[PDB]
Amino acid sequence: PGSVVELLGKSYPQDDHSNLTRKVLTRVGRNLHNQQHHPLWLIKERVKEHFYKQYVGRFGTPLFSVYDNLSPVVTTWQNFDSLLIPADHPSRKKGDNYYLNRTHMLRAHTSAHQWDLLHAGLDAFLVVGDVYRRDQIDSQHYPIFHQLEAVRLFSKHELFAGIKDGESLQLFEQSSRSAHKQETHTMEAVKLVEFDLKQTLTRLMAHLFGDELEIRWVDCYFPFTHPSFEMEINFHGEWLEVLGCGVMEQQLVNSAGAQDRIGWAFGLGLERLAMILYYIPDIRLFWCEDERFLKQFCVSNINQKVKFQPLSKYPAVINDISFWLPSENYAENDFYDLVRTIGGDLVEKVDLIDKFVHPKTHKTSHCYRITYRHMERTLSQREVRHIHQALQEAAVQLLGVEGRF
């Protein structure tokens, strides 16, 4: 912890919100999504190719400009306010974000760029980048992952171009908001935008996974879209959400300068997609540099089909860690950072298997079961003991927790 943070050549004074970790910092700028041949870059190029094809292939398809090198450091206004996220919304919890301070943060999603790009006059674009969130620790969650945003605007004439008396139809009106549309949108408009959205995503998935993937649309919520959806893909007997989307909140589109227009947007988890497309077991493999893994994504063209062969799964070592939280001063996702710092990518997952308050003291006890597993080799009991003991001492010094063990 400190007084000034220096990130990407810029300086940020620290305050009550500051909670960025040196570990996260060592990863900012990495840009896996722009790394030639990396599984993520691969998915990026394939999505890009699809959009390009569609532009040249169909007259109605617009040209999508692509931005994959925007700095992840944004203002809380870009990441939250511009997307209409309430001041008291849980997604703002310091516990789930990496804030430099009260006004700047590492983006939690690529949607943080929607407003500025809209304000710049663009009608169709894609933003691809690393995003950051403080989350639990397991093979499916990492503090850093990547997303690809897409925004598509429609003018009234463009939307109803294929309808006989379409110029008589409108985009806007003043009714009420319902489960199916916004208060200022016509059902006519929404039905067409929604259909375009789903057809676009469905075709993209078809291009990425082939005609023989099981997908389902699920209704959800986002403060920046409505109606909103999550597309899920059934993989290994299990419906997994791979993207979020919907019809852009008109207030957002209006404040950016495009009253005129109505649009849709979506944000899809490149990791999630990659893990499904190539089986990848574990999110941590995206960050290793074991050429048993990377060498498998060295294709002649992004069209050559990678036939990923999962590495061996080495034995894990499991150790529990208990302690006392301080006096009303502690967060779960905190200890999770001490863990990422000390155990790094050696930790496969952390589980809070138990927690209780002592009557006398008033002083809550936490017991975490940490699974230590190397993605590249067999960890010995010895080295794990050393990492586990360092985590133990660190907890006691830098989480005011008491050595209960």
Author numbering: 11 to 415
From the primary publication:
Mutations in the mitochondrial aminoacyl‐tRNA synthetases (mtaaRSs) can cause profound clinical presentations, and have manifested as diseases with very selective tissue specificity. How clinical manifestations of these mutations relate to the changes in three‐dimensional structures and kinetic characteristics remains unclear, although impaired aminoacylation has been proposed as possible etiology of diseases.
Here, we report four crystal structures of HsmtPheRS mutants, and extensive MD simulations for wild‐type and nine mutants to reveal the structural changes on dynamic trajectories of HsmtPheRS. Using steady‐state kinetic measurements of phenylalanine activation and tRNAPhe aminoacylation, we gained insight into the structural and kinetic effects of mitochondrial disease‐related mutations in FARS2 gene.
